[PDB]
Symmetry: C3
Subunit: 248 residues, 3 copies
Amino acid sequence: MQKLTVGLIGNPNSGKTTLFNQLTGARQKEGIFATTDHQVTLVDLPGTYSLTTISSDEQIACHYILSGDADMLINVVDASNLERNLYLTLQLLELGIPCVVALNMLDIAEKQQVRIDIDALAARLGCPVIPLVSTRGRGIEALKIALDRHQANSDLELVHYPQPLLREADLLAQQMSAQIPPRQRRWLGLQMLEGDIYSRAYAGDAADKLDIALANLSDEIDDPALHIADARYQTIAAICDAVSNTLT
Amino acid sequence: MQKLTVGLIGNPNSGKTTLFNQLTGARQKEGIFATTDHQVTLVDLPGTYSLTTISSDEQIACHYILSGDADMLINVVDASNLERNLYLTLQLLELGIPCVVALNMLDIAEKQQVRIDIDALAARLGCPVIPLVSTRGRGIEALKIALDRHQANSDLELVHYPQPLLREADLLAQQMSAQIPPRQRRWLGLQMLEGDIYSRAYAGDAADKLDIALANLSDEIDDPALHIADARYQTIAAICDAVSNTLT
Amino acid sequence: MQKLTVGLIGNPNSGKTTLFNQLTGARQKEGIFATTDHQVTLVDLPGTYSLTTISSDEQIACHYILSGDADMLINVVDASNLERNLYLTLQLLELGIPCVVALNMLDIAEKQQVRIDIDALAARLGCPVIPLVSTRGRGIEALKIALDRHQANSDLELVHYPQPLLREADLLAQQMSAQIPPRQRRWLGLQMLEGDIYSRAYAGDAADKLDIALANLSDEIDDPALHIADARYQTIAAICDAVSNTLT
Ligand SMILES: Nc1nc2c(ncn2[C@@H]2O[C@H](COP(=O)(O)OP(=O)(O)NP(=O)(O)O)[C@@H](O)[C@H]2O)c(=O)[nH]1
Ligand SMILES: Nc1nc2c(ncn2[C@@H]2O[C@H](COP(=O)(O)OP(=O)(O)NP(=O)(O)O)[C@@H](O)[C@H]2O)c(=O)[nH]1
Ligand SMILES: Nc1nc2c(ncn2[C@@H]2O[C@H](COP(=O)(O)OP(=O)(O)NP(=O)(O)O)[C@@H](O)[C@H]2O)c(=O)[nH]1
Ligand SMILES: [Mg+2]
Ligand SMILES: [Mg+2]
Ligand SMILES: [Mg+2]
Ligand SMILES: [Mg+2]
C-alpha cells in the first residue's frame, strides 16, 4: 500500500460530491478509501469553469492544484455538456498534473441522444476516461483500478498555439521560480499572457516582465488573450467533433 | 506457405461449427483451408464457459489449449452476450496463446440494440477483433487476413490482481515444470489458487505446495478464489462499459 | 511560416470545390490561405474514382500527384459512400504521399443512418481523418490544424498482397528510375502488374520488363490484375466493417 492524495475537480454541478460520497461510503472535509494498491486521501474541491480569472465556488481548486498537495486529479466531467466541461479538462492537461477523467452523468447524456466514444476521447486527451453514473455507483470499481494504474498523462501537443505566443510564454518560463517544472512554467506564462491575476504570485522574476512580452507581439498578434482562448476552443471543438456526435 | 494449426474456442452456441463450415466449405474431424500465406489445419473444439473447473461439452478445449497443438486460437464470441462471453476470452489472453477474436452474431447484437466499438475492444484486449456474421459468410475474408498477420498478442496487464495473490502465484510459477513458459506458469498458479483441479497435473513441484501458498494469505485475503474471480469480472465490466453500451 | 502546396483529391462530387471555396474564402486556378504555420497554395484537382486506367474529369490528378508538385494531399471523401470512396484513398496511402482525409458530407451520412468511428478509421488508414460539413464550414479549423501537424503517414502494411505479386512488383521497383522513392516504385510496379498504361512512362528500364514479370506468375496467379484488385477490395471491406455499420 502506497499513499495517494487525489483531488476531485470539475465544473459546478458535475457530480463531484456524489462521486465523493460513493468512494468514501459517506453517511446520508477529507475522505479516505482503499483501492487495491493505495490508501487514497480524497479532497472534494469547489467547482470551477476555468483556472483563469482576469477579475473577481472557487479559484480554491486552482490554488489547491498548484500547491502540489494532490498527487493525482479526478476530473469529473458532465457527459451531457461535454464541450463546455472540456475547457477545464484541457487546462489541467496543459498543466500536466496526473489525471483521470470521470465521465459522469452518462445516463443523462444517453437521454439527450449524446454518443461519446470513451477510448477515442482518452486517446485524444492522453489520460484515462472512466465512464460513470455516480448516483448508481456505476463505474466506481473501474475508476479505482485507473487510480492504481495511471502514472503520467501522455505528453501530447494538445493545443496548437501560434509560435509567437509560445516564444514569449517560454521566455517567462525562463524567468520564474525554476523549481517549478517546465510544463507548469509554460502554463504559468500562457496564463500570464491571457491576463490571469493569480499566476504572477507563482512566478519568480514575476509580474511585469509581462509588459515586455505583451508588447513584443503587436507586430504579430492583436489580442493575445483572445488568440490563446481561441486556439483552446478550436482544440476542444476538434476533439468533440471526432469522438462525439457534435459535428452535425 | 507455412503451416498453421488453429483451434476454434468459445462458449456453447457461439457459432464455432458454423464458422468451421464456412472456412472449410463443408458439405451440408479436422478441417483444412488456405489463407494467403498459410495452410491452416482447423480444429472445432467443444464449447466451454471457462477454463476453470473446481468440480465435475468440454474441459477438452482446455486440455487441447495446454497441449501446445494449436499455434493460434480463433476465439468465437457471441456479440449479443459480450460480457458473459468475455470471461473465457480473458482467460485465453492471460494464458498468452496467440489469438484472434471472431466477434460473431453481430446481426443479433444489432437487433437487440447492442453497439460494440470493434477496434476499441481489440485495443483493450490486445488482439485483433474481427466482426462476423458466420451464417452469412460476412467477415471471413478479414478473418483470414488476420490469421496471416497476427503473431503475438500485446503484452497488457489485463486483470489488476491484489499483489499478495500474484506473489503466491509466482512462487508456484517458480516450482513447476520450467519448460512451460512464465506467462503460462503464473496462469497455472492463479488457476491453482482458484481451486482448479486440472492445473496441478501441469505443474512440476506440483499439488500441495498449494497449501503453503493458500495459508500464506489468511493475514491478507479471505477467499482467494472469490478475489481472483472478482478482479476478473471487474476487468470485464470495465472493458464492456468503455467499448459497448452496457454502462447505462 | 513555411510554404505548403496541397492538392484536393477525391471522387467526382465529393465536395472538393466546396471545400476549396471555404478554405480560400472565394467569391460566389490556385488558391492561397494561411494556417497557423503555413502559407498554403491549394490546388482543386479534377475528380477521379481511381488512379488506375487500363483504357481511355481526370487522370490529371494522378499525373499531378506523381509530379511531386504537392507536398500534401487533402483526400476529400464522401462519408455517405465510404466504401466506394476508399478505393482511391487506399491508392494514395499505398503511394505514401502525406495526406489528410477530409471526411465530408457527414450530414448526409447521418441522414442515411451511417455511423463512422472517425479515429478508428484514422488509425486503420494511418493518416488523420477530419470530419467536415463543407457547405456549413464545419471542421475547417480542425482541418487547418491537421495540415500544420501532419508530417508523414504511418508506415502500415495496408493491403495483404499474395507474396508472388510483391516479388514481381519489387523486381520492377529495382529496374526503374531509382530517384523515385521505393514506396512509389513498388506502387508503380503493382500498377504495371494491373495493366495501368500511365505507369511505364514513370519507370526506367520501363515497359515490357513487364512481360517477363507477368509470365513469371502463371504457375501461381491466374489473373494478377483481378488478384491485386481483390486484395484491395478485401482490405477496404475489412476497414468499413470495423469502423462503420456496413457489416450488417
Ligand atoms: N442522473 C444523474 N445525476 C447525477 C449523477 N451524478 C450526480 N448527479 C446528480 O447531480 C446533482 C449535482 O451533484 P453533486 O454531487 O452535488 O455535484 P457537485 O459537482 O458536487 N456540484 P457543486 O460544484 O455545486 O459542488 C445531484 O442531485 C446528483 O444527484 C449522474 O451520474 N447521473
Ligand atoms: N443470426 C445468427 N446466427 C448464427 C450466427 N452464427 C451461428 N448462428 C446460428 O447459431 C446456432 C448455433 O451455431 P453453431 O455453429 O452450432 O454453434 P457452436 O458454438 O458450434 N455450439 P456448440 O458448443 O453446441 O458446438 C446455429 O443455428 C447457427 O445457425 C450468426 O452470426 N448470426
Ligand atoms: N449536404 C452536403 N452537401 C455538400 C457538402 N459538401 C459539398 N456538398 C454539395 O455537394 C455538391 C457537389 O460539390 P462540389 O464542391 O462541386 O464537388 P466536387 O467534388 O468539386 N465535384 P467535381 O468532381 O464534379 O469537381 C455541391 O452542391 C455542394 O453544395 C457537404 O458536406 N454536405
Ligand atoms: Mg459538491
Ligand atoms: Mg459446434
Ligand atoms: Mg473508437
Ligand atoms: Mg469541383
